[PDB]
C-alpha cells in the first residue's frame, strides 16, 4: 500500500554552556541505502538566540518547520517581541499534540539562551513531551552521542576530580570529535559538519570536514 513514513537518518546534538549554547548536525540526507545529497543542512535558525534542529522523516521536518516559522510571526506581530527559547519549546508541544491521532514523525531539538543568558536545551518526542536538560542528542546516532557527553560534559562516574564549568574552547572540540567518531560507525552521519554556536554577542557558524564514506 502506501507507507506514510520512512527513516531518513541523521543526527542532532545540543549542549548548553554557561554563557553559550552550541547546536550542531550533519549535512547528510539519505533514505534507505541511497544518498540523496551530501549537503542538506537540518539546522534552522528561528531567532538570533534560538536554533532548532530537526531529525526524522524529512517530509515532516520541512512542513513542521514552516508551521513554526508561521507561528513565530504570529507571536512577534502580536507581542512586539521575539519568542524566548522556553516559549518556543512549549509552543511546539501543543503543535505536536494537535496531530495526536496522526502524529508527525520527527525528533525535534531546540536550543539557545534564555533571558538569564544560560543555555537551554529542549528535547522532544513525536507526541510532544518535553524537558529541560544541559545536553541532549537525537537521530540515528542518538544512542552513541549520549554516553560520551555524560562523562566529558557531565563529569559523571568520576571520583575525586576537579569539576570545571563547561568552556567554549572545549565544547567545540568535544562536539567535533563525537561526530568524527560518529561518522565512523554511523552510516547516516558524515560528509560535512555544521556547528552553530549561540552566544550573547550573536550566532557564529562553522564548517568542519568529515569522511565521505
Amino acid at each position: 500500500r502506501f507507507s506514510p513514513y520512512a527513516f531518513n537518518g541523521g543526527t542532532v546534538l545540543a549542549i548548553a554552556g554557561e554563557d553559550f549554547s552550541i547546536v550542531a548536525s550533519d549535512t547528510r540526507l539519505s533514505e534507505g541505502f541511497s544518498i540523496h545529497t551530501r549537503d542538506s543542512p537540518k539546522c534552522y535558525k528561528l531567532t538570533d538566540k534560538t536554533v532548532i534542529g530537526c531529525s526524522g522523516f524529512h517530509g515532516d521536518c520541512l512542513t513542521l518547520t514552516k508551521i513554526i516559522e508561521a507561528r513565530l510571526k504570529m507571536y512577534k506581530h502580536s507581542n512586539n517581541k521575539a519568542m524566548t527559547t522556553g516559549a518556543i519549546a512549549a509552543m511546539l508541544s501543543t503543535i505536536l499534540y494537535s496531530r495526536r491521532f496522526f502524529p508527525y514523525y520527527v525528533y525535534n531539538i531546540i536550543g539557545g539562551l534564555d533571558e538569564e543568558g544560560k543555555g537551554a536545551v529542549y528535547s522532544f518526542d513525536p507526541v510532544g513531551s518535553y524537558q529541560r536538560d544541559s545536553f541532549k542528542a537525537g537521530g540515528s546516532a542518538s544512542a552513541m552521542l549520549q554516553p560520551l557527553l555524560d562523562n566529558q560534559v557531565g563529569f559523571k562516574n568520576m571520583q575525586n576530580v576537579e569539576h570545571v564549568p563547561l568552556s567554549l574552547d572545549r565544547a567545540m572540540r568535544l562536539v567535533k570529535d563525537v561526530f568524527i567518531s560518529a561518522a565512523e560507525r554511523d552510516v547516516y552521519t558524515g560528509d560535512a559538519l555544521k556547528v552553530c554556536i549561540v552566544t550573547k554577542e550573536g550566532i557564529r557558524g562553522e564548517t568542519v570536514p568529515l569522511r565521505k564514506d
Binding site: 520512512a6 540526507l29 533514505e31
Partner: protein, 216 residues
C-alpha cells in the same frame, strides 16, 4: 491510493554552466507491457523553467492540468512576474504533501529544473514529500545508475559546458537503456538556457553490443 496503472520510467537531470539538461524516455508502461511508445514526458513552464516526472503518468496529466492552468493564469495576469524554479519546486512539495493527509496520495516522482538570472536550479520532490536541491538528480534506478556517473564528473569538474553536458547525458541515457528493463530506446533531450526551454525531438543512441562476442 488504490490501483494506478499507467506506469512511467526513469528521468535524469543535471546542472552545467548557464543551463540545465533534463532527459527522459517517451515510453509509457502498463504492468510488464510496453504500450504507448510516443509520449511527451517533459513539460515546459514559462520560459525559464521545465518539469519532468515519473511514476503514474495519468496522475502526471492531472498535474499537467492543475499546474498548467495555474502557470497560464499567471501569463493571463501579466503582472510582470514568473514562477521561479524554486516556487514550482515548493508548490509541488506541499501539493504532494496535501494528498497524504486525505489518504489519497498520487503516485509520481517529479524533477524541477530551471535557469533564471544566472542561477541554475535543479530540484527533486517525491510522493513521500522528500525535497532537496542537488547539482545532479535522477529518478527510479537512475539514482542507482546515472547518479554516481554525474557525481564523479561534478567532483572532478564542477563546471561543465553545454556540449559536455549533452555528451554526458547521452552516455547516461546509453547506460540507463542497458540496465533498466523498463526503459526504452527513444528519448527526448530538453535543455533550458538563457534562450529559454528548447525541447529536442525523438532521439536514439548508438549501442555497443560487442559483449555478445566477448561472452561467447
Amino acid at each position: 491510493t488504490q490501483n494506478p496503472m499507467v506506469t512511467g520510467t526513469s528521468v535524469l537531470g543535471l546542472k552545467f554552466e548557464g543551463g540545465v539538461v533534463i532527459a527522459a524516455d517517451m515510453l509509457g508502461s502498463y504492468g510488464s507491457l510496453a504500450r504507448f511508445r510516443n509520449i511527451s514526458r517533459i513539460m515546459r513552464v514559462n520560459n525559464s523553467t521545465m518539469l519532468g516526472a515519473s511514476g503514474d503518468y495519468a496522475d502526471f496529466q492531472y498535474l499537467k492540468q492543475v499546474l498548467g492552468q495555474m502557470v497560464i493564469d499567471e501569463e493571463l495576469l501579466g503582472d510582470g512576474h514568473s514562477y521561479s524554479p524554486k516556487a514550482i519546486h515548493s508548490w509541488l512539495t506541499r501539493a504532494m504533501y496535501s494528498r497524504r493527509s486525505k489518504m489519497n496520495p498520487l503516485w509520481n516522482t517529479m524533477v524541477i529544473g530551471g535557469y533564471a538570472d544566472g542561477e541554475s536550479f535543479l530540484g527533486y520532490v517525491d510522493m513521500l514529500g522528500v525535497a532537496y536541491e542537488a547539482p545532479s538528480l535522477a529518478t527510479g534506478y537512475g539514482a542507482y545508475l546515472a547518479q554516481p556517473l554525474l557525481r564523479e564528473v561534478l567532483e572532478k569538474q564542477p563546471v561543465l559546458s553545454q556540449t559536455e553536458a549533452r555528451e554526458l547525458v547521452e552516455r547516461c541515457m546509453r547506460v540507463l537503456y542497458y540496465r533498466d528493463a523498463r526503459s526504452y530506446n527513444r528519448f527526448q533531450i530538453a535543455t533550458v538556457t538563457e534562450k529559454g526551454v528548447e525541447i529536442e525531438g525523438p532521439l536514439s543512441a548508438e549501442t555497443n553490443w560487442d559483449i555478445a562476442h566477448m561472452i561467447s
